[PDB]
Design a protein around this ligand. Structure first.
Ligand SMILES: CCCCCCCC(=O)OC[C@H](COP(=O)(O)O[C@@H]1[C@H](O)[C@H](O)[C@@H](OP(=O)(O)O)[C@H](OP(=O)(O)O)[C@H]1O)OC(=O)CCCCCCC
Lengths: 86, 171
């Protein structure tokens, strides 16, 4: 439920790591950094963190998947103009 | 006074706990005190993953409690478009009525779900079906101030002057 990381799969030369973030995390541009005992900080890469309408514990959670699609994933909108009767 | 563990897993969309439970107890249609299966809970909260797990483990897609509320009824009432689709592909009956003779189209139109109403109509739902008081879906759409639902039902050739048992038109 907080920042965490765990190796789901591994071989001799690689680790498959599942990283979680808190449901109340600060959004924006992030840097992921690795610290190996007795070494200097190493930059692993950059990622951007956003709000999650798909997560039940997030403040922007939406009950419906159709509503999630319509109000977050659809780029084709309709602005209604004119008069009330037209 | 607590729910069965499978109902709790269905509510939380916890497929790992549900898988462990179904490995231990192979019955996905376990009944709560109200008589609702975990598929009813999954349809209520639109938990797609646990619903697919339950249906793959043999849950009755057309389960009928004493009150006659099928999971399709709950999905149509709640506005769960994806759950309505999934239940329809798995064999959900389109004409089943509740204790008060409400079809899933009645539940969709009463709450003004245009997409769900169109999906049910495209699957053959009866647009002129009546409740115990003679209310058609257009009556329920007009009662809830659901303008687009009334428009869609009229587009599907619903009777604009259908009367209830009290001779009430949608007007
Ligand atoms: C007399 C004292 C003892 C001497 C013998 C000591 C013998 C002995 O124990 O060797 C292994 C040990 C390993 O230590 P290791 O390198 O794993 O530990 C890192 C080291 O302490 C750095 O100085 C820390 O930097 P900083 O403080 O955070 O800036 C770094 O911090 P962090 O990565 O944890 O953040 C530490 O991880 O020490 C050596 O480094 C070897 C050469 C040490 C020097 C050899 C003798 C000069």
């Amino acid at each position: 439920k907080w920042w965490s990381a765990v190796v789901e799969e591994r071989d001799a030369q690689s680790w498959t790591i599942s990283v979680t973030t808190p449901a109340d995390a600060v959004i924006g541009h992030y840097s992921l950094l690795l610290q190996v005992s007795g070494r200097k900080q190493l930059l692993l890469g950059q990622f951007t963190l956003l709000f999650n309408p798909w997560n039940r514990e997030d403040a922007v959670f939406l009950k419906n998947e159709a509503q999630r699609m319509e109000y977050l994933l659809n780029q084709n909108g309709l602005i209604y103009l004119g008069t009330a009767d037209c | 006074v607590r729910l069965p563990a499978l109902h709790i897993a269905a509510r939380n969309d916890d497929t790992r706990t549900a898988a462990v439970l179904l490995q231990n107890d192979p019955n996905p249609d376990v009944l709560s005190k109200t008589g609702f299966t975990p598929l009813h809970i999954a349809a209520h909260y639109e938990n797609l993953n646990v619903a697919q797990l339950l249906l793959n483990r043999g849950a009755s897609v057309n389960f009928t409690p004493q009150n006659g509320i099928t999971p399709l009824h709950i999905a149509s009432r709640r506005g769960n478009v994806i759950m309505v689709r999934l239940l329809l592909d798995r064999g959900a009956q389109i004409e089943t009525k509740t204790k008060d003779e409400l079809t899933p189209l009645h539940c969709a139109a009463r709450n003004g779900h245009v997409r769900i109403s169109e999906i049910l109509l495209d699957h053959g739902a009866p647009i002129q079906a009546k409740t115990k008081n003679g209310l058609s879906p257009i009556h329920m759409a007009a009662q809830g101030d659901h303008l687009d639902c009334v428009r869609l039902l009229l587009q599907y050739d619903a009777e604009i002057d259908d009367i209830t048992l009290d001779h009430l038109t949608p007007l």
